[PDB]
């Protein structure tokens, strides 16, 4: 009674602090900078052989290897330059909604409707990609996972909970709880000390890895959040939702910096990512097209086409050379 | 042009291409079925009839046709966000128990299991991801329904049904009420079968319903339909 009414007063105090801290709209400030203009990207490689619905991809840190998750029960690790397949990992559960590639390149994660995060060792002496660790103890479907290290990984799940996993021990060290809705995506910051996770209550919550508590909560979006990606410096993050908008939140400013709403597109956003500079925001949509959004001019720098079905996933590589977008038509297409 | 490793690297990729296409052709032949319903419906029962955390996958082979049954009842999460995964499925096996009208829900607020199951069927049947997918409806526990309907009428739980207290009439009435929830009847069939611990007839029913879906797919494949 008194507690919950105090929470309403504290929430209004935060709304007061947000309105007070804001004086100048971001679109007014960035008017001086010239627009990037039409940015045309041509297909460079088309990756074939999935034969099923792709859900996730993740780049390697060498900017050449990438893993991809398909619904035939096969994780495929790709040589992006020569179109060759590096590994084909047979999965026990065909329903896999995410995949991660370790920064060292040793391990590969996947997760989905089986509620099990499976870690796959690539540099084993036997030469076949075998299961190193099966992480269990989520009540909901895994939607996203990213390697902090060869021993640490943060996974998002459909039980409104994120968790920090010890791969060698096999149990969750830090449990991140507090989401009112099911978490759908996570992104690691470059320092990997903090991460932010968007859930189905239209909220994006900043989490601290070492402490284990929620530092900040962002409630700009309307319906529910599907994607989230950090800005390259580590202070901002654009967030993709299912209301045809992409919103940019700053950790320090604690406000929505910019919104990306265009009229004729009413469909949702599956995946977002940033370029190497951060000037381009590339968002996968459901209208079979990837739109390139300028970070500061709030325009459409470019449009990627050629996908039969909706683009499930989109990651921009480490150096920033290429962009590979995965769609539900079993084709990965690399855009440079 | 290609170095000695690069030719072997392409050769490794071609062998993987051979392995994936064999698994892809095998997966296309295999029939995928989605298992839905309440927890007390008898999902556990009907799986055991056909054999004899996360996804429970059931593999059974009837008349040279491989079946995959995916039980999703263990998940507590919101279904709307992961229901898009099962778009390319052959049929929906939706099981409910007929004796649940009498039963009272765990939640404190008054509610009806039949009314929960109809809303459970309504979101599945009218789903945008399940428009071309037929639903294989199972109505379970009819022997327990037969005993309960003599003692306790169907008229008491909702006044709308004015039919006489007959076992055959009530079971037929509950059958069409699920079928009345279908809003696209031309492109979606509802296959209803009354099950009370039945033998291979349950497997035969599923096989008969799946056979028409394969006809529906092949006729679309031919272009005539």
């Amino acid at each position, epitope marked *: 009674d008194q507690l919950r009414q105090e929470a309403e007063q504290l929430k209004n105090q935060i709304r007061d602090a947000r309105k007070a801290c804001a004086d100048a709209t971001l679109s007014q400030i960035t008017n001086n900078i010239d627009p990037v203009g039409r940015i045309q990207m041509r297909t460079r490689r088309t990756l074939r052989g999935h034969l099923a619905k792709i859900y996730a991809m993740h780049w390697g840190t060498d900017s050449r*290897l990438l893993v991809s998750a398909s619904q035939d029960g096969k994780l495929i690790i790709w040589d992006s330059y020569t179109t*060759n397949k*590096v590994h084909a990992i047979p999965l026990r559960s065909s329903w896999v909604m995410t995949c991660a590639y370790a920064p060292s390149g040793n391990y590969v994660a996947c997760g989905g409707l089986d509620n099990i995060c499976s870690i796959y060792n690539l540099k084993t*002496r036997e*030469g076949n990609v075998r299961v190193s660790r099966e992480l269990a103890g989520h009540t909901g479907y895994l939607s996203c996972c990213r390697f902090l290290d060869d021993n640490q990984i943060v996974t998002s799940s459909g039980d409104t909970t994120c968790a920090l996993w010890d791969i060698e021990t096999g149990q969750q060290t830090t449990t991140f709880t507090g989401h009112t809705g099911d978490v759908m995506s996570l992104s690691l910051a470059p320092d990997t000390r903090l991460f932010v996770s968007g859930a189905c209550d239209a909220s994006a919550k900043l989490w601290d890895v070492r402490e284990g508590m929620c530092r900040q909560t962002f409630t700009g979006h309307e319906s529910d959040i599907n994607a989230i990606c950090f800005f390259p410096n580590g202070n901002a993050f654009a967030t993709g939702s299912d209301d045809a908008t992409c919103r940019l939140f700053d950790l320090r400013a604690d406000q929505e910096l910019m919104t990306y709403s265009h009229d004729n597109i009413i469909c949702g956003i599956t995946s977002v990512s940033f370029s190497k500079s951060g000037r381009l925001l590339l968002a996968g949509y459901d209208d079979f097209n990837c739109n390139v959004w300028d970070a500061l001019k709030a325009d459409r720098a470019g449009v990627l086409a050629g996908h039969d079905n909706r683009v499930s996933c989109l990651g921009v590589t480490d150096d920033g050379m290429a962009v590979a977008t995965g769609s539900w038509d079993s084709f990965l297409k690399i855009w440079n | 042009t290609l*170095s000695a*490793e690069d030719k072997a*690297a392409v*050769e*490794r990729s071609k062998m993987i291409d051979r392995n994936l296409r064999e698994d892809g052709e095998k997966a296309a032949r295999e029939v995928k079925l989605l298992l839905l319903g309440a927890g007390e419906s008898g999902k556990s029962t009907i799986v055991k009839q056909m054999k004899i955390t996360g996804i429970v996958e059931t593999h059974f082979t009837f008349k040279d046709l491989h079946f995959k049954m995916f039980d999703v009842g263990a998940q507590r999460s919101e279904r709307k966000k992961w229901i898009h995964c099962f778009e390319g499925v052959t049929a929906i096996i939706f099981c409910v128990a007929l004796s649940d009208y009498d039963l009272v829900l765990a939640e404190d607020e008054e509610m009806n299991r039949m009314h929960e199951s109809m809303k459970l069927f309504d979101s599945i049947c009218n789903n945008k991801w399940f428009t071309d997918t037929s639903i294989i409806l199972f109505l379970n526990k009819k022997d327990l329904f037969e005993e309960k309907i003599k003692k306790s009428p169907l008229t008491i739980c909702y006044p709308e049904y004015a039919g006489s207290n007959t076992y055959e009439e009530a079971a037929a009435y509950i059958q069409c009420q699920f079928e009345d929830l279908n809003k696209r009847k031309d492109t979606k069939e509802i296959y209803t079968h009354f099950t009370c611990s039945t033998d291979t007839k349950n497997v035969q029913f599923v096989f008969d319903a799946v056979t028409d879906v394969i006809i529906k797919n092949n006729l679309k494949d031919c272009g005539l339909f």
Partner: single-chain antibody, 231 residues
């Protein structure tokens, strides 16, 4: 992971002998398989290669036709069929597993070797046959090539093998810059086409042995003469 060879002994010249190497502890069907021979008082020499799935087969020009290589994936055994063995084939034959992909480490595990006694093209060059060394000093080992091994993709295919006396040769550095699994950080390879360098930071007694250089730009594969360290 273990490879053991069988089928040795004394063979009459012009006779026939069929070697078999049994593989244990690794997925045999996914590795390509090499035969490498070593004369008793000379360096290594490549014989034959069969790929995974038997898709391609390569031989050296001096062993072409007489030797037959096959493999059986369900039984995990590599078969070498030999016809009309001559007096130059008195060498110990090794089995080698080699996986090939971007970032792979081929030639990583070598077999034990089967002694065979008979009783009657890029050329890698070694500057020095044998340099005496002491533990604790840097050891510069240099191999030179008859052709620039720098391919257009940026991968220079040089392999540094160490063969300790009475032991199988082991991979140290693959593709001239990458350390194999189990190799200490002290070993380090550098250079470019036609000029290569091998260095050891802090020499140990177990590092003593014969150091081979092998190009892998085009077939046939050619080993160096080797460099021997002594204490």
């Amino acid at each position: 992971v273990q490879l053991v060879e069988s089928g040795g002994g004394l063979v009459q010249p012009g006779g026939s002998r069929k070697l078999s190497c049994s593989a244990s502890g690794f997925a045999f069907s996914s590795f390509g398989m090499h035969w490498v021979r070593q004369a008793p008082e000379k360096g290594l020499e490549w014989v034959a290669y069969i790929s995974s799935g038997s898709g391609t087969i390569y031989y050296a020009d001096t062993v072409k036709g007489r030797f037959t290589i096959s493999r059986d994936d369900p039984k995990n055994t590599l078969f070498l069929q030999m016809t009309s063995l001559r007096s130059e084939d008195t060498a110990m034959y090794y089995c080698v597993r080699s996986i090939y992909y971007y970032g792979s480490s081929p030639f990583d595990f070598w077999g034990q070797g089967t002694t065979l006694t008979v009783s009657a093209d890029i050329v890698m060059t070694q500057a020095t046959s044998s340099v005496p060394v002491t533990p604790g000093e840097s050891v510069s080992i240099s191999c030179r090539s008859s052709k620039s091994l720098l391919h257009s993709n940026g991968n220079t295919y040089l392999y540094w093998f160490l063969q300790r006396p009475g032991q199988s040769p082991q991979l140290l550095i693959y593709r001239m810059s990458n350390l194999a699994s189990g190799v200490p950080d002290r070993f380090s390879g550098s250079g470019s086409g036609t000029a290569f360098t091998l260095t050891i930071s802090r020499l140990e007694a177990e590092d003593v042995g014969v150091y081979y250089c092998m190009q892998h730009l085009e077939y046939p594969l050619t080993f160096g003469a080797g460099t021997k360290l002594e204490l």
